[PDB]
Design a protein around this ligand. Sequence first.
Ligand SMILES: Cn1nc(Nc2nc(N[C@@H]3c4ccccc4C[C@@H]3O)nc3[nH]ncc23)cc1C(C)(C)C
Ligand SMILES: Cn1nc(Nc2nc(N[C@@H]3c4ccccc4C[C@@H]3O)nc3[nH]ncc23)cc1C(C)(C)C
Lengths: 299, 309
Amino acid sequence: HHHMRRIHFVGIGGAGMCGIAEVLLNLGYEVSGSDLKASAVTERLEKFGAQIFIGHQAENADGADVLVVSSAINRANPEVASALERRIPVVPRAEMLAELMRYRHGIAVAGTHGKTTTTSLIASVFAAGGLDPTFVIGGRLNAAAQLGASRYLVAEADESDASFLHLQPMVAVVTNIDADDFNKLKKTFVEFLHNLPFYGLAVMCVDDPVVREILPQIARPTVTYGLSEDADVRAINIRQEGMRTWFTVLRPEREPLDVSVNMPGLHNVLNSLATIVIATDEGISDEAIVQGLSGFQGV
Amino acid sequence: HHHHHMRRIHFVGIGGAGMCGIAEVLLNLGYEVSGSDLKASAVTERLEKFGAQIFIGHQAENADGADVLVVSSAINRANPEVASALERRIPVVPRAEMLAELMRYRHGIAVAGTHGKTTTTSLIASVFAAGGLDPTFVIGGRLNAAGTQLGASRYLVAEADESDASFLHLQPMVAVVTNIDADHMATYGGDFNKLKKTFVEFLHNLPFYGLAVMCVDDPVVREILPQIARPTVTYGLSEDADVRAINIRQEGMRTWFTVLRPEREPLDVSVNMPGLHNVLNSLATIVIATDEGISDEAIVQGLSGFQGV
Ligand SMILES: Cn1nc(Nc2nc(N[C@@H]3c4ccccc4C[C@@H]3O)nc3[nH]ncc23)cc1C(C)(C)C
Ligand SMILES: Cn1nc(Nc2nc(N[C@@H]3c4ccccc4C[C@@H]3O)nc3[nH]ncc23)cc1C(C)(C)C
């Protein structure tokens, strides 16, 4: 009925691996893992319930329903070789990482520029609202308290990643689609957005020419943002004051809200606008949006 | 809306035989459903009794309040309901896309493969009904339920056509591949190779906790089996199938066979259709039924109760 009970990580002390294991533990799965040396990472994992093996031997994979490996599927590893011989699924860590969105309210931040900063800004505003998300930057899981505890999983989505077209987010942001086959690149972003359920939300920067271009092709609920006169969630009254930028944000069915972001540059007004759309969608108060954006120090 | 962005779905032409079933399921899921049609009918009256809001005629205002519009297929920008929706960035989707989407809300069992999808879908529905699971099932783009409340049960069984635009966007809990056959396409080319990758990508839409049900009698299914990084149960007459038919006795139009299953005693079943392919269709059904926890008696009675599509 449920065909994954025990997940085994080959190299579980690795920087991308330990976080995923911790989330799977918080989800209630049995997690085991092998690593070449014990560390604070593995010791923390066993206290969360991981079964830790030092060294690689075939028997370490016994009982596992699925194996997670760092990247390449290396049959020279005896744990992997045992799994493959017995037809146990072996998946790269990026695929298990994407899979985590199936269990959480996933917010995927895509686009050529601004993914990392916007992900960080969302995490800071959600923290100010007490929503304490787990968020993924550079393939590493962090919390804003065990990983995966929160209802929310905020993750950058890199268009060049093999897992990009397999995410199952509830909310997807596209900040821009930039040339830095471009037409195949556009279709990739359209297919990404159609992985939203019909009750999900596509958050689209209409200041970006290509995002605006593909907007009518997205058959999912949308909120647009930008400085553009037709953006649903719009920045006006922008006054750049040294290291902080003040602006008023217009939102559908809300009074104008005066905010500031504690970083200069017009692109950071855009990163903030994306964050505001998302925080607004989750019911975060004006006060928490103001504190998260203006209290922010950097990625 | 906030957090959940679909509350009301509007159907243009809701009285159509392909549309009314989808509306009924969405109503059973708890959504608000509205629909327009050129004339009232017994179909619209039934939908109104289930809670649908019915509009006769097409006027832009019929779409007011809708979060998503469903059209039969083509998106006709001359239709005032469609045009009003598009003007407001309300998604307008063909019914095949809304139909695919229903699997997200249900324990979806998608039956794929070049041959046998309809019979296997029907047999699974027959066995799940015998097990008291009251499945809704999809053959030919039409929704059906065990008896005559579409969508009431957790279970949704649907054929998955590789040539459909929604094929690589299904979210099943269980996926079947009966075979991957080139038919009149040649075997060792680029076209057939793209078809293989399509089936592999389809199976990778299973969650890691889902199940891939794979006919290893088929050469191409056997070929792609090592690429599937999902839990798999294989079936067939092959000696190495996890779930195997043996002791096959073809009796006119009725076929007896014994099924071997891991950790189970051999089970004698029969199907009321001739041909080894119907033994294969039955084996796929037994794998899924076994995985679901359905009793031997429901598997036997479900398979023998089926007379045809
Ligand atoms: C940290 N960071 N964050 C960004 N964020 C966004 N950048 C843009 N576009 C960009 C932009 C915006 C204004 C002037 C020049 C450019 C160039 C590019 O076009 N669009 C956006 N929409 N939502 C967010 C966002 C962009 C950047 C970089 C460019 C400093 C790496
Ligand atoms: C109704 N129906 N149902 C089927 N079901 C399955 N057919 C096959 N194989 C197929 C087969 C079988 C016998 C002769 C020719 C072919 C071609 C392909 O090879 N494999 C299977 N695995 N699970 C189920 C199943 C097949 C058929 C047809 C062929 C009568 C349309």
